[PDB]
Design a protein around this ligand. Sequence first.
Ligand SMILES: *[C@@H]1O[C@H](CO)[C@@H](O[C@@H]2O[C@H](CO)[C@@H](O)[C@H](O)[C@H]2NC(C)=O)[C@H](O)[C@H]1NC(C)=O
Ligand SMILES: *[C@@H]1O[C@H](CO)[C@@H](O[C@@H]2O[C@H](CO)[C@@H](O)[C@H](O)[C@H]2NC(C)=O)[C@H](O)[C@H]1NC(C)=O
Ligand SMILES: *[C@@H]1O[C@H](CO)[C@@H](O)[C@H](O)[C@H]1NC(C)=O
Ligand SMILES: *[C@@H]1O[C@H](CO)[C@@H](O)[C@H](O)[C@H]1NC(C)=O
Lengths: 228, 318, 96, 48, 208, 193
Amino acid sequence: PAYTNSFTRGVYYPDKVFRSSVLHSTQDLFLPFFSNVTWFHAFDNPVLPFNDGVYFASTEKSNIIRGWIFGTTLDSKTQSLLIVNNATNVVIKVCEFQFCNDPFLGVEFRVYSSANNCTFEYVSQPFFKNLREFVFKNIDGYFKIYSKHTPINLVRDLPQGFSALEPLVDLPIGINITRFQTLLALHRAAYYVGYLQPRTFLLKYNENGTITDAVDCALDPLSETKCT
Amino acid sequence: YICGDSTECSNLLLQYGSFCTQLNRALTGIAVEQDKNTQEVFAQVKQIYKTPPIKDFGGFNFSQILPDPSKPSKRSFIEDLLFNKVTLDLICAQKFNGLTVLPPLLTDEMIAQYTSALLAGTITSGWTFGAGAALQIPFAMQMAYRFNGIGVTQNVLYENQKLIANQFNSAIGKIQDSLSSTASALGKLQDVVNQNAQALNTLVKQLSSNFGAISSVLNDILSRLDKVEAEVQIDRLITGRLQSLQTYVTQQLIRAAEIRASANLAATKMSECVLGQSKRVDFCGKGYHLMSFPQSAPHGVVFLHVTYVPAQEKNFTT
Amino acid sequence: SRLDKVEAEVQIDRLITGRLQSLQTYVTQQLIRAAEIRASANLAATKMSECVLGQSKRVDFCGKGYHLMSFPQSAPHGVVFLHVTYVPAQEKNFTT
Amino acid sequence: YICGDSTECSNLLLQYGSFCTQLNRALTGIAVEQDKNTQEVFAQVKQI
Amino acid sequence: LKSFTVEKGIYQTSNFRVQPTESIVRFTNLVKNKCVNFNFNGLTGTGVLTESNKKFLPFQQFGRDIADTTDAVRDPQTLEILDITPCSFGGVSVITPGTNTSNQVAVLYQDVNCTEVPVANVFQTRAGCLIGAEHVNNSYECDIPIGAGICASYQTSQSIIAYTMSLGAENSVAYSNNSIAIPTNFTISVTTEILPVSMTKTSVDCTM
Amino acid sequence: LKSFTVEKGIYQTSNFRVQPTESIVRFPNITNLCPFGEVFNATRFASVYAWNRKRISNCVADYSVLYNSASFSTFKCYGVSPTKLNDLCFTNVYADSFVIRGDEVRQIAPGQTGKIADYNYKLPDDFTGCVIAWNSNNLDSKVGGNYNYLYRLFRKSNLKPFERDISTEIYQAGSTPCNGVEGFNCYFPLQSY
Ligand SMILES: *[C@@H]1O[C@H](CO)[C@@H](O[C@@H]2O[C@H](CO)[C@@H](O)[C@H](O)[C@H]2NC(C)=O)[C@H](O)[C@H]1NC(C)=O
Ligand SMILES: *[C@@H]1O[C@H](CO)[C@@H](O[C@@H]2O[C@H](CO)[C@@H](O)[C@H](O)[C@H]2NC(C)=O)[C@H](O)[C@H]1NC(C)=O
Ligand SMILES: *[C@@H]1O[C@H](CO)[C@@H](O)[C@H](O)[C@H]1NC(C)=O
Ligand SMILES: *[C@@H]1O[C@H](CO)[C@@H](O)[C@H](O)[C@H]1NC(C)=O
């Protein structure tokens, strides 16, 4: 593991309300700029806290990340959420899965020992050398998945840049989730985790309806002046 | 603005008396004063004097300040620089919320005509035309007597005449490009506009507040609630919006007071300096005052002061 | 006459708030009007001292034309000046 | 001056929102102006 | 004015309304380019609904303005974007000379186009629309100011006339390089000027 | 001025009182008495859809006289304090009486919604007056089922406040038209408690 510094990345569109050339100030769950966070290699995909939200970035060669697991215990005792791929489509299920301590995917579907209390089961449209970034945020209700990918997919720390993910996916599960587990492919990669915190941010909008600049309010009192 | 159409909100607002009338009255008073200010500042001549035929003033070039005879618009050269320097979307949002902007009484072309008459009269007749009927007199004589007004014997002027001319046409040049280099000078005009915006862009977004209610839009309250909770939840919106309107009106009253005081100073300066010769020190800038020339500007006035400064001192025993 | 004590309080609160707000409004406009009158009276004092006690070369501050003398008169809440001034007329042309 | 700790009071304040700006603005509009007055009365001579 | 007699001047009455006279319900068929009442997924609004030129994202439904308002809306059945404009425009003022003098009046509508009638002689001007008056092309001094260089009065058979402001009488100066003008006679002129000094003191006992 | 030391001058103080010194009561010369005693003890109270109305005038309306043997579990007042009842005069006195189910009692008020308030008996929001409600199972109920009391269950539109409607037309619940006779999805609006 190592330390990742957020070079003005982790931006996303805040709400579904159209704007154009508006310079507007908001407050929401963001990733503070230049923040030092943990970065993992792959070999470990452990269970990590999910108190607020995750900006999850994956660098790999191709489809190494099998998917994601969410829950509070990751066992049949409590309800768990599984996001996986069948090589053509993404499948999202909320069930009291009996998740083993090593839910590996050998490429044996040993993610879950048993399937009961299938409260949700859904299939969607079809989806180093690949840097895919996702934003997962959860309320006791609907769940938001934002997606992006970059062609600057190198192996070392991410280069300085600026783009905004979109609220591509919103799906209700209603269940309580506090922990997450990465699902890799046991082939016979690396990933960035970014915690989301309550922060105020200023957003700059161009001639057309998009976001192309932002200012972190709490970085330094100079930023406070820019806010005022 | 308080009710946003719909009848129930106006029905409630009727019970709050007639606060809704006197704020209209105060804004009316402000606008009438705004008209009276300019009309009193610029209309101190009762005769529209034409630009004089031919141009020969002993070597004084006036082509910059006098209006262009060829341009259908009567803005002079320096006036063009100024009218291009100062500028003037939520503009449509102001009309969308009943914030009506009213046109000023005089047309800025009429201001051009007034100031053009002032310039022509002053350079053709000295200070006499302020007294009554205008009486013509040659320009060199006027300059001589204006020197004699501050104690320099008039003969001086003639024996240096050509030299003096060379300075004036130079000095105005130094002013000209000056305005086109930095506009920080026009800031005292610009602020007068800028503050206005900061008021309205507040007053409009002041609608986003709640004052404790459950939704900041009246129609949402009406759609979500019955006929007995509507009053108890809308009274707080009514109170808050009435509060905001009162705050805006009071700010306008104070700023109008300050602008009125400055307008009185402008009128006094125009009457004492352009239209005559004044012994009051530093009332026309540094040095002993000789003469003045006025120019229009967006909701404001520009004065050019022409003064006399000695230099190259020598010692003597007295 | 109609309601009990706690109801009386929860009713009279609104009336006292509203009436006090009205009185606040009235006092504010009185203050502003007083300031404007004060400026006008200050100008009157300067003018009376300059144009009655003495003679001034300032132009158009005392009426059109060259100024000779002045007379004061009183009036309800105000003062009125008669300016006696001098105006030339019947101009003629000459060569200089 | 309004809340003084008790973050609940500040959250309640934010529904009124804008007001706290103009207060802090208005005084500053006065506060700077004062110094200017002093200068106009004493800084007319440009030498020592 | 809360009075039965009115002095010479101009007074404000109210802002103009322009009724919608139509209600549209969107889950009513789609209607465009008419000042109507409309509803979108429970949201109520009123105005003219015209085309749009924005680029709403697939999850976007409402594009909001600063004053709690939305200017661009997506239809709930055909999912195309449209722009909205309310049109309740125009303050109304009444120009009248003294009531003791006559009873005809003139009506001024502010910033509204004459082409947009909403009303039941007609003159389009920089201030808006002016009705009741007859326009002339001469010049006199001001009697009642309308705006933007237009001022009106009552004149003779008798009606109300609007005209351009008169700056003043024309004149010209016989300037040259050797001519002078000298007075020969003089007059003593006596003029009046008036200044207020005070107002009426008042006292209020708040408690009672 | 809130100090022990005050400089020389003049000051404004509180207002002059002028005491009242006397209390006087003027009153009409009415000496009658209200029929409330028989009104409340009345043997028959009508059904909710046929609520009974009475106008009272020219009498004295003491309310303590009820409490000799009064039994009112449910009491409510709007726009007036019961305490001041004996200290006021009332131009119009209208008394309405009926019998309902206890569970529907909460429906009778200004602004409440429900079957009775929307179909039988409606009250204005600016109403002032009183509501007196007591259980009467000991007298208004009998073995074998007491059905003398009826109510309106179906109606085309909600009634106005203070509206008495006793229409008995067969309500058309379904889309099939009413042919002036009982039919499918066409029901008599009256039902028996
Ligand atoms: C009088 O005023 C004008 C304004 O400058 C001058 O004449 C022209 O000035 C511009 C720029 O200063 C030059 O480009 C032109 O070549 C000038 N033309 C002429 C004929 O001079 C000049 O100061 C004065 N012109 C005259 C005839 O005196
Ligand atoms: C200067 O102005 C006066 C103003 O009228 C004129 O004087 C008149 O002259 C004749 C005889 O000279 C008198 O009969 C008139 O009574 C004078 N008029 C007045 C009002 O007094 C005349 O224009 C000039 N003064 C003189 C003496 O000629
Ligand atoms: C006049 O004499 C003083 C005394 O030495 C000297 O300082 C000064 O320079 C002289 N004046 C000028 C203008 O030089
Ligand atoms: C009402 O009914 C009971 C029983 O008949 C009776 O005792 C009582 O006196 C009656 N109420 C009054 C005020 O008479």
